[PDB]
Design a protein around this ligand. Structure first.
Ligand SMILES: COc1cc(N2CCN(C)CC2)ccc1Nc1ncc2c(n1)N(C)c1ccccc1C(=O)N2C
Length: 258
């Protein structure tokens, strides 16, 4: 049901992601591959995400190319990351080396640092919203996407959202939260990369009470070969104290990411 302007210039392919749907497409003039995200409309949440996607341009954030708006849906031509999401990559590989995990955290922290410099909190940083990028070198980067929950922090936020595995304890406590919930989610992800399981796993109230306690353990034998530098960084990212918890700048300054 797609407008002529899109089909005129793009050959729409298979669905690659399923509120919205994402499809593969080929730009006819160049044969270069892109992504088409189709957001269905109701008879304010879409306006917010496009306003964010218009402002965010960063090599580690999925780029918005152009918008085609019709009454029933909104069409977004977006960058295609051909690696797939990080969730599928973690399912196939089990765990990563410290060198691979540290380079991936460098990409995530770069995107978060850029977002926080705009006072944008993502609020949905998780492996399903990270995309693995294939370089010419064979090296792989990460790109952050899906800003449907992103918002500008002009004061403390209180709305509970995000996937519980990655949700910061201040969100669960409903006492107010800001940009640093993104750092906590990045800390949980880094922890998953280094060992293959989340730091807080629960049994749904068990998981929340464990996050609120925020006791990060590095169990044997899974963490025996992991460096103390990595355990220090993850610990500083997963601090319950919002003031002591690392900012994205502090994450990037840490030796393990350098
Ligand atoms: C070949 O590329 C992919 C393959 C798979 N599948 C998964 C299923 N498996 C059976 C085969 C491999 C998946 C994805 C991508 N790519 C991708 N490139 C760009 C996205 C995006 N997904 N979608 C889906 C997004 C997903 C999360 C966050 C943002 C986006 C976002 O806004 N954009 C614009």
């Amino acid at each position: 049901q797609i407008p002529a302007t899109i089909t005129e210039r793009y050959k729409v392919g298979r669905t690659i992601g399923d509120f919205a749907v994402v499809k593969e497409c080929v730009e006819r003039s160049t044969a270069r591959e892109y992504a088409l995200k189709i957001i269905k409309k109701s008879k304010h949440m879409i306006q917010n995400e496009v306003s964010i996607l218009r402002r965010v341009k960063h090599p580690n954030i999925v780029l918005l190319i152009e918008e085609m708006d019709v009454p029933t849906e909104l069409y977004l031509v977006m960058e295609l990351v051909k690696g797939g999401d990080l969730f599928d990559a973690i399912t196939s590989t089990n765990k990563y080396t410290e060198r691979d995990a540290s380079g991936m955290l460098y990409n995530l922290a770069s995107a978060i640092k850029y977002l926080h410099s705009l006072n944008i909190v993502h609020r949905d940083i998780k492996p399903e919203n990270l995309l693995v990028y294939e370089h010419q070198d064979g090296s792989k980067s990460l790109k952050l996407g899906d800003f449907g929950l992103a918002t500008i922090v002009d004061g403390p936020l209180y709305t509970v959202c995000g996937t519980p595995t990655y949700v910061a304890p201040e969100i669960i406590a409903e006492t107010g939260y800001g940009l640093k919930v993104d750092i906590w989610a990045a800390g949980v992800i880094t922890y998953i990369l280094l060992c293959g399981f989340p730091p807080f796993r629960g049994s749904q109230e068990v998981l929340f009470d464990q996050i609120l306690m925020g006791q990060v353990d590095f169990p044997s034998p899974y963490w025996d070969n992991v460096s103390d530098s990595a355990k220090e960084l993850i610990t500083m990212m997963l601090l319950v104290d919002v003031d002591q918890r690392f900012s994205a700048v502090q994450v990037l300054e840490h030796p393990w990411v350098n």
